[PDB]
Amino acid sequence: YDDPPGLREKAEYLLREWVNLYHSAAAGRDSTKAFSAFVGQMHQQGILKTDDLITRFFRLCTEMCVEISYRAQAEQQHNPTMIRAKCYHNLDAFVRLIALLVKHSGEATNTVTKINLLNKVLGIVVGVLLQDHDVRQSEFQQLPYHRIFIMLLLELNAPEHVLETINFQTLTAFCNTFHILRPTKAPGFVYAWLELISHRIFIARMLAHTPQQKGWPMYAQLLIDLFKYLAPFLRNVELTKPMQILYKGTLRVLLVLLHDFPEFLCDYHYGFCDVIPPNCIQLRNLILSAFPRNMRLPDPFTPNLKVDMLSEINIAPRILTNFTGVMPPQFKKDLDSYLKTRSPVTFLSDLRSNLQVSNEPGNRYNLQLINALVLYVGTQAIAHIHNKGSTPSMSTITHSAHMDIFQNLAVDLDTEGRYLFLNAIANQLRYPNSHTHYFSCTMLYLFAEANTEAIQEQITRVLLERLIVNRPHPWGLLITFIELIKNPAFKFWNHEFVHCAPEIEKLFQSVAQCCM
Amino acid sequence: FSSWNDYLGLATLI
């Protein structure tokens, strides 16, 4: 190798001595004298002399811990949670060593060298992990690295002054490490990775502990990594059973975030919906049903509910995603041009020309571009109406460039395109806000102004499929559906697709059981 | 179903 001779023996001796100390000494003066003596001895053995020697020290320690894990598993299999307790014996010892070396690195006020040491060690561990993954392949075990990472995270999130002065930077280091170990880059570690990013304490420290919400974008990045990895598997229905574990983990963390951090799921709903395939009704529903806890949703079954007279209706939701960038510059320019001047009309056929990418069934369109187009046209419409001195309604969103785009997409797109379009609209049907209201009115208008029953039945089936899911449900979705069914102006029950079919009746019964 | 009230008059448990 490239290691200096005799270093392995030094590292072995030191690691074993430290394990012994760790499992012999109690908290108090004993732990401090033990760590001080051990550090002194580290200086004596000339391991802290150069950065390289430190690197090789941590690397050798990691490798030895891992090999102890493997050997322990083997010895277990040969001789019929205790083995777990051995692996974790050595691993927890080493972790304690790392945390202590980070905590007491340099001065008490000098946080720089502490964080640098933390990122150094984490990097080394990452290297060992990736190497082990590339070599062992199928025999690779996630457990030791998982243990190291989570126990180090827990140790460094202790209620101590020095540790609290560097907490956010610690969390930053761990976020970077988790991002580098993303399942698209380290597939053999995806389960442990999911366990690490969906750990309750990590989530707590990321989404609550830090002010200014600087932790929200990072965790959002982690979740987006997860969804990006899961998308092609979740999209194929034949992989439902083998993906049960990861799906249930994702469902779990989404449930956690829903019940305890709904604001976060609100602020980043668009990116998540953008990455998660449209067939995953449940997860997406968890993401869309989220609403700020300082808001009280009125009962959708309230006798004659005045939606337009709600206070939060005129307020716009916060979107922390740059959906505009998905649009090409020239297309965006032509879009703004037509929105400003309502000319020329050819721009609409050109719209279908711009949204479609392939002729292959299922992969004909650019989903992100459709979502972005819908949301952008919607927001521009809301702003336009607001600038005219009025609020969006059934008679204020009509006969304009925006609605021209909407109706044209509603007729000129094929069934697939229409589905993606209607879904792109439905993704904004959430808690009382300007987007929810505008897109509700847009959906209902598209239903009413329709010249054929195709798009009507399609809308109905979209709402239906989005409603058949465990409680809760997005407010605007249920509101839109209820308004469509109850308001005699839309004459819903006089149509043919609902008159004959007992299938859509079954769907209606399911919706009645889930939402009513 | 034939209307809104007709839909609300459904008997699911039976």
Side-chain angles (χ1 to χ4, degrees), chain A residues 2-28 30-81 83-85 87-213 215-516, chain B residues 1-12 14:
Chain A
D2 208 341
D3 280 19
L7 183 52
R8 146 155 285 275
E9 289 73 16
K10 297 183 184 179
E12 191 164 355
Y13 150 71
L14 287 181
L15 183 66
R16 273 156 198 195
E17 235 300 301
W18 174 253
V19 170
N20 187 79
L21 285 178
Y22 177 78
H23 297 98
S24 61
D30 298 332
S31 60
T32 56
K33 66 158 178 50
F35 174 71
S36 300
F38 188 81
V39 163
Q41 174 72 330
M42 288 177 71
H43 282 105
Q44 298 319 300
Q45 299 301 296
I47 302 213
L48 308 179
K49 286 185 177 183
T50 67
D51 275 43
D52 189 82
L53 288 176
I54 303 179
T55 295
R56 305 190 119 82
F57 171 75
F58 283 133
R59 206 245 307 128
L60 283 168
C61 287
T62 305
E63 292 176 337
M64 286 181 55
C65 288
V66 166
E67 286 304 316
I68 288 174
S69 294
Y70 277 99
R71 189 178 71 241
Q73 279 292 328
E75 289 187 19
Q76 172 207 32
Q77 292 180 343
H78 304 152
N79 289 324
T81 52
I83 318 298
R84 151 220 160 184
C87 306
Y88 296 1
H89 199 257
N90 273 86
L91 288 168
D92 294 340
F94 179 45
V95 165
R96 180 60 174 179
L97 182 54
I98 299 176
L100 275 178
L101 283 178
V102 170
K103 183 187 304 181
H104 293 91
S105 178
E107 316 302 324
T109 59
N110 188 92
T111 65
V112 183
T113 54
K114 304 179 185 299
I115 299 306
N116 289 338
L117 178 58
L118 176 53
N119 279 285
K120 193 172 190 301
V121 177
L122 287 176
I124 295 177
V125 179
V126 163
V128 175
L129 198 166
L130 293 181
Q131 167 73 4
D132 192 34
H133 177 26
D134 287 26
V135 175
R136 283 280 194 171
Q137 211 70 206
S138 59
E139 291 178 346
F140 175 75
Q141 298 200 217
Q142 317 165 239
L143 201 63
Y145 306 97
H146 173 271
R147 187 66 170 181
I148 299 177
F149 283 136
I150 188 54
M151 296 296 282
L152 184 53
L153 181 68
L154 291 172
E155 284 259 9
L156 293 181
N157 280 279
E160 300 185 22
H161 185 65
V162 185
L163 259 46
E164 277 295 333
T165 55
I166 67 177
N167 179 250
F168 173 69
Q169 307 189 36
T170 302
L171 297 177
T172 300
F174 276 94
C175 276
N176 295 327
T177 300
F178 291 162
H179 184 48
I180 297 172
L181 289 173
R182 78 185 75 97
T184 59
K185 282 291 186 296
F189 197 66
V190 58
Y191 293 89
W193 184 82
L194 179 54
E195 280 276 0
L196 285 179
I197 73 165
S198 62
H199 191 279
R200 196 61 167 80
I201 283 201
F202 180 61
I203 297 179
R205 303 304 282 264
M206 290 299 306
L207 299 182
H209 202 216
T210 69
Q212 98 231 294
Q213 303 170 354
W216 287 25
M218 315 175 66
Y219 194 80
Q221 184 192 36
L222 267 49
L223 290 175
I224 285 178
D225 292 335
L226 174 60
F227 298 140
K228 277 188 180 179
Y229 173 77
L230 294 186
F233 300 109
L234 290 177
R235 186 173 183 269
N236 186 271
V237 81
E238 291 189 359
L239 306 180
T240 302
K241 289 182 172 57
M243 291 287 304
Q244 282 177 352
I245 310 300
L246 297 175
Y247 179 81
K248 206 160 190 176
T250 306
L251 179 71
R252 203 205 78 173
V253 61
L254 274 176
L255 280 162
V256 171
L257 296 182
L258 173 61
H259 287 75
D260 288 308
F261 309 94
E263 294 83 11
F264 179 77
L265 286 189
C266 291
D267 286 19
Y268 293 89
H269 81 110
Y270 182 86
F272 296 160
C273 289
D274 214 31
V275 182
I276 299 180
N279 55 316
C280 297
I281 307 300
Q282 191 177 7
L283 312 171
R284 190 188 61 190
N285 177 81
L286 294 179
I287 300 183
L288 291 170
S289 308
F291 62 95
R293 279 167 286 182
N294 58 330
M295 299 181 183
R296 193 168 185 176
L297 313 185
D299 187 23
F301 297 90
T302 299
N304 246 332
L305 170 66
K306 311 305 179 303
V307 182
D308 60 328
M309 288 303 303
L310 295 179
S311 59
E312 299 294 328
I313 271 299
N314 309 287
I315 307 302
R318 46 193 297 104
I319 304 299
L320 306 187
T321 302
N322 183 22
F323 54 92
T324 298
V326 187
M327 295 179 292
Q330 179 57 37
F331 175 74
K332 213 274 185 173
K333 288 156 60 180
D334 294 332
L335 177 58
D336 289 335
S337 182
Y338 183 82
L339 286 184
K340 191 184 75 64
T341 64
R342 205 184 182 184
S343 185
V345 73
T346 53
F347 171 78
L348 313 169
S349 40
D350 286 349
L351 280 169
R352 165 148 185 184
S353 274
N354 284 276
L355 295 178
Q356 186 168 354
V357 177
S358 172
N359 287 324
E360 170 182 309
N363 305 282
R364 293 189 181 99
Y365 296 88
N366 192 277
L367 227 185
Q368 288 69 18
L369 183 53
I370 293 181
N371 303 325
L373 174 65
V374 169
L375 180 59
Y376 184 75
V377 165
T379 56
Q380 294 299 304
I382 300 176
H384 175 57
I385 296 179
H386 279 169
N387 289 324
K388 286 155 53 188
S390 58
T391 64
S393 67
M394 293 293 177
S395 56
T396 326
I397 69 176
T398 61
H399 309 297
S400 58
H402 316 87
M403 194 51 64
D404 286 335
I405 296 172
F406 283 155
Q407 294 169 286
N408 180 88
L409 287 183
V411 287
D412 278 20
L413 291 176
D414 67 334
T415 300
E416 174 173 333
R418 289 181 183 184
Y419 183 60
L420 299 183
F421 167 57
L422 295 177
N423 280 332
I425 303 180
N427 286 338
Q428 320 305 327
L429 297 182
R430 301 186 291 154
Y431 65 93
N433 56 69
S434 60
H435 295 198
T436 294
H437 192 206
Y438 175 82
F439 281 103
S440 185
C441 297
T442 295
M443 188 84 70
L444 288 169
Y445 178 70
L446 285 177
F447 186 93
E449 203 67 18
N451 293 125
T452 185
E453 279 197 5
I455 191 66
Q456 294 177 336
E457 180 184 351
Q458 195 167 16
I459 288 175
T460 305
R461 289 185 180 275
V462 162
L463 299 189
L464 258 42
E465 81 166 353
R466 289 204 175 203
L467 281 175
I468 306 178
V469 77
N470 280 12
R471 301 176 168 89
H473 302 100
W475 183 83
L477 181 70
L478 192 63
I479 283 295
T480 293
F481 175 73
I482 287 177
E483 179 69 10
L484 177 60
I485 304 307
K486 190 188 66 172
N487 198 330
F490 299 100
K491 300 183 177 182
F492 177 82
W493 298 106
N494 295 336
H495 292 92
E496 294 291 337
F497 65 91
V498 68
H499 163 259
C500 60
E503 165 200 7
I504 198 175
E505 179 174 351
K506 283 191 292 291
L507 292 176
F508 264 85
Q509 184 181 5
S510 295
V511 173
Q513 189 177 357
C514 300
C515 308
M516 302 182 185
Chain B
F1 300 93
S2 63
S3 65
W4 168 246
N5 287 344
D6 177 45
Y7 174 61
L8 294 175
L10 180 60
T12 55
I14 308 176

